[PDB]
Design a protein around this ligand. Structure first.
Ligand SMILES: Nc1ncnc2c1ncn2[C@@H]1O[C@H](COP(=O)(O)OP(=O)(O)OP(=O)(O)O)[C@@H](O)[C@H]1O
Ligand SMILES: Nc1ncnc2c1ncn2[C@@H]1O[C@H](COP(=O)(O)OP(=O)(O)OP(=O)(O)O)[C@@H](O)[C@H]1O
Ligand SMILES: [Cl-]
Ligand SMILES: [Cl-]
Ligand SMILES: [Mg+2]
Ligand SMILES: [Mg+2]
Lengths: 354, 354
């Protein structure tokens, strides 16, 4: 899929010069149409399905008239100017290769702004850990899984969307960028989104990629459901990760469940206690009822891990339609560090990959 | 504070008959004004600060013109009719005592519709259990506290507002009314609110009053913040309970924190683990920032209970402005029943009362 580019200028010599170079030297990557009339350019966007329009800076382009996902940039003769009328400024007289790369940027930005979670086989798997059973170790098991899969050679991204999430207890890395910066970038309708997001990525000692915790916990209240969807879509859009592991607080809100339903697999953690088992089946019963909604399908994508399971005091749930893939005991007098180390040796984490 | 009542009818004989009886035999409880003109009656509501207007059924009263919290009912000659134009129907020719009691009902309904949590000394104390530390035993400790206080002779109401709340594990009672009925009554702009709410009340074997869990967990998603405030206000409005114990899921949402700030005391539960301690201080830091809002004051009303505290593995937080009132250990191989029994003997539950 080549990028279709429209060029709008009164300098025909310039238009011919670019379209001539682009439709020969870059004909494998681009397909370029040129215009001297604004009305012809705008209606051609819709008709030819153009992905990037670049207009000369004196034009005032209303991008609502495109009637299509299509990026906008302005050509200029003025150096040192990053934006013109809120869009990327492209210097006419730099090297064509540099113009080309700016066009790719404008295309990328436009794609990144409407990214959404994908189930295509060439995108990262999205695995969401969640549980209605408090303190059963869901976050620890998710972190352990990320490490376990990193240990096997997977390129793993770890995303923690809890208000009081403990990302920084589990993973450490140099750098001052946090999830707060990620959120800011997603909310500012601003350019270079995907590069900004990539600059916030840290990498743990064991090779797990992640964003460190927001500077203060209340920051995460700023992220919407649309935003999480766009963020995960954008992480898949980076074409680097095998797997995205998301630690998501469980609840029965319809929008939470629609997000959950976009997971390739849902892993639920449970300790098999009386209150845990009861809580889970309370969740299960209402999920089933809510699966009457077209956009909600959850139970068929869930697998269960028992964690902190007492031989003497816990009991697995029977007669439910959720496969148990594994169990871990309750480690006595253990630190977080120790528990995670013990967990990463659990063979059942491989089952999440297949 | 006597109820001020306005009567609107074209039958002056009838108006005189009632106002004569009411302003003599019921002059201690009521203060009654009568009208034959609609405009005089309506403007008198605002001016005299009338609490209940009763108009003859042929009148069409627009209660938005009252410009005041004031109940509306209709006088009728027709038996077997509960409502007229959406309001309580009052039979003219039943006993005056029965008319009186209907007026009290209309007044009560009107008060119940705008009930809100009170901090007055003659209303039930509102004690909210909440915690950002998952699975530390917050709900168990709240139930244990309710039982402990019942055991001392307190009239205790227990309210559980978790989606997957475990009320029915902790308390059992005969009856088919659940919290679902409570929610329905609060949402239907309908009469006898306080009597409807009272009909849903069950009483545990140990004397704790409560509403059993919603029929399905998703029902509780229907209750708003305004609704919880009105419900608790209405439970205080019943003038029966010393204390209302509320199990409320913690979060940093402003509306959650405004509700929390109406508590007379907030009890936070923590196990002193590394992840628990970390989560709490993440919450604390953002609460402090959010206390810049006028309607949020939380930290100064909090006390901490350590539950499941390991001598070997837990540590209390130092250098914080939250008083620890007590601690409980982690009971080994214990059922819910056993844990609660052991907890109700904790002397520190008395400190919640003083
Ligand atoms: N297998 C295990 N053995 C012993 N302790 C464990 C085990 N797994 C987790 N824990 C401990 O259980 C506690 C809860 O862990 P974690 O914070 O991951 O649970 P959660 O279910 O994610 O909690 P929340 O409900 O707050 O999300 C921590 O103290 C953690 O160290
Ligand atoms: N003092 C105790 N000793 C041993 N186990 C306990 C103790 N208190 C609570 N528990 C157990 O801890 C688990 C969590 O209890 P509970 O459901 O009350 O926690 P919670 O903090 O309310 O959970 P959630 O985070 O889901 O609200 C249950 O298995 C309960 O039996
Ligand atoms: Cl055991
Ligand atoms: Cl110990
Ligand atoms: Mg967690
Ligand atoms: Mg709880």
């Amino acid at each position: 899929m080549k990028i279709k580019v429209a060029l709008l200028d009164k300098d025909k010599e310039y238009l011919d010069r670019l379209t001539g170079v682009f439709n020969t030297k870059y004909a494998d990557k681009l397909e370029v149409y040129s215009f001297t009339d604004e009305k012809n350019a705008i209606e051609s966007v819709k008709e030819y399905r153009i992905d990037v329009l670049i207009a000369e800076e004196d034009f005032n382009i209303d991008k609502s008239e495109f009637k299509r996902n299509c990026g906008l940039a302005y050509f200029t003769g003025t150096p040192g100017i990053e934006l013109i009328k809120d869009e990327i400024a492209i210097c006419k007289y730099q090297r064509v290769d540099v113009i080309f790369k700016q066009i790719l940027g404008v295309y990328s930005d436009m794609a990144a702004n409407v990214a959404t979670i994908s189930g295509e086989n060439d995108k990262s798997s999205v695995v969401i850990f969640t549980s209605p059973c408090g303190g059963v170790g869901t976050s620890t098991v998710a972190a352990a899984c990320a490490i376990a899969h990193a240990n096997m050679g997977k390129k793993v991204f770890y995303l923690n969307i809890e208000q009081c999430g403990t990302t920084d207890v589990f993973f450490q890395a140099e750098g001052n960028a946090t999830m707060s910066d990620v959120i800011y970038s997603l909310k500012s309708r601003k350019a270079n989104l995907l590069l900004k997001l990539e600059s916030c990525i840290k990498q743990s000692q064991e090779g797990v990629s992640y964003f460190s915790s927001t500077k203060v916990a209340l920051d995460i209240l700023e992220i919407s459901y649309a935003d999480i969807d766009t963020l995960i879509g954008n992480i898949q859009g980076m074409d680097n990760y095998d797997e995205i592991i998301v630690d998501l607080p469980f609840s029965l809100e319809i929008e939470k469940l629609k997000l959950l339903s976009k997971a390739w697999r849902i892993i639920v953690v449970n300790d098999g206690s009386q209150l845990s088992n009861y809580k889970f089946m309370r969740a299960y019963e209402s999920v089933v009822l809510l699966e009457q909604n077209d956009d909600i399908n959850i139970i068929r994508n869930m697998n269960m891990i028992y964690n902190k399971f007492s031989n003497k005091n816990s009991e697995m749930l029977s007669n439910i339609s959720i496969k148990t893939i594994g169990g871990a005991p309750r480690y006595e007098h253990a630190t977080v560090r120790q528990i995670i180390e013990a967990l990463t040796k659990m063979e059942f984490f491989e089952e999440i990959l297949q």
